[PDB]
Structure to design on (476 residues):
């Protein structure tokens, strides 16, 4: 039975995941994070920092098309960051996950942190998560393409006007929700805030759209953003992994 | 005791002991109607007339302040109290929990199913919808087609991810039909039907996504849910 015990150990380390051939794990007993500090990547590094889970971060170099490599694609077939491998997954077996949304939900369940205990407020929290994932992320990103990236050279500005109006409309929904609340779920800081902070920060910072979306006419979203940014875990998460 | 929910002032419940669905048979609305049909849960659907801006009334906004469909109220929510929910994704997860169905048994496979859910919610829906805007709706009038070309390319790329995933699988999660399939089928149907983009995205060059769609559309609950509620 020496062979059989080696077999059971093999299913608990990470050599069965082909991504590790390109980004080797130094700490096979820690969550492997494959990411960049983009608005989507930082959701997960922030969550990991807020939970105190040990992890090992790996920058994925998009300049070299490393997200298009067979090794990266074996974990996320969509070719995007973030992705993780949790060696201590359900049933003490390693689990790979892509999609920031699935990962945030996974880490909140794993740790019993950043999701209300109350069943109704838990469901409510997931609506706001889904709101960021289907609305905020994709729409702010389209604004970015037409304002900051290659879409900015297109002469017809109606696309740009469309994503500016939708980004402002989304911010207005946040603004009514944060009127009289500390966090999206009131006194509880949750994966809904962790999903959303980076995108708002990015919109008014890197994207250079602060005036474009009339951000400084808002009251409640700016104060909420300031609250999130004062959290040490947010400050840490925002710069992990270092850019390659 | 739904009286506390102001939406019922504009869309009264004839059956306050049943889930109230506020929706339209759009690619996002059909996710929830299909789920409800697949589960067999009693519910009472209400068409929300966008032609009359009804989704921007105080009554609708009290349930979804984002002013979109679908939305539900379950009178027999957690703690035998009513729960309002918006977002098709959150509703699918809630209904899967309510019924113990359309998620895999295995916890690892459950989290994997939620990946494909989120890939749909963050990728398929928003991108296919932008293609809709520039090919089917008002954006079709813009002479310069670079925006359209962008969303055609992204939608094809998304279909390419599904095509590789479905290669040798019956459903997205292998032998398990789940909320991942329920979330995605309507968007793919709509893309090649109502949006008129079947040739634009080179759909008939694919093998696995077309086969998967046919298997989904052969299900009676999908056929029922695709047309509920009836358009106002
Ligand atoms: N939807 C995914 C990631 C989506 C996404 O677009 N991520 C970006 C960075 S913010 C990326 O990987 N971009 C690379 C590419 O599009 O090739 C999530 O929320 O986890
Ligand atoms: N992320 C949402 C999106 C819902 C959505 O965009 N719904 C459309 C129908 S496909 C709508 O209600 N539009 C209303 C409006 O644009 O005001 C979900 O999946 O539920």
């Amino acid at each position: 039975l020496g062979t059989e015990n080696l077999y059971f150990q093999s299913m608990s380390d990470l050599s069965s995941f082909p991504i590790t051939k390109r980004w080797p794990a130094q700490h096979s007993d820690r969550i492997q994070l494959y990411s960049l500090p983009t608005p989507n990547g930082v959701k997960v590094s922030i969550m990991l920092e807020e939970t105190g889970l040990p992890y090992e971060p790996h920058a994925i170099d998009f300049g070299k098309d490393h997200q298009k490599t067979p090794e990266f694609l074996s974990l996320n077939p969509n070719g995007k960051i973030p992705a993780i491998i949790d060696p201590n997954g359900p049933g003490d077996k390693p689990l790979g996950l892509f999609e920031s949304g699935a990962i945030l939900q996974y880490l909140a369940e794993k740790t019993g942190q950043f999701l209300p205990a109350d069943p109704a407020r838990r469901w409510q929290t997931l609506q706001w998560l889904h709101f960021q994932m289907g609305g905020i992320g994709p729409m702010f990103g389209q604004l970015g393409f037409f304002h900051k990236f290659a879409g900015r050279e297109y002469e017809d500005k109606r696309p740009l006007q469309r994503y500016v109006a939708e980004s402002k409309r989304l911010l207005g929904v946040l603004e009514a929700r944060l009127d009289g609340r500390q966090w999206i779920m009131d006194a509880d800081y949750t994966i809904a805030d962790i999903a959303t902070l980076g995108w708002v920060r990015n919109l008014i910072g890197f994207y250079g759209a602060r005036e474009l979306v009339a951000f400084d006419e808002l009251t409640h979203v700016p104060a909420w953003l300031e609250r999130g940014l004062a959290r040490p875990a947010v400050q840490r998460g925002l710069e992990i992994p270092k850019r390659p």
In short: Residues A 38-40, 62, 67, 79-82, 99-100; B 122 surround glutathione (ligand 1) (CB under 6 Å). Residues 35 and 95 of chain B are 8 Å apart (CA to CA). Chain B has two domains: 1-103+220-232, 104-219.
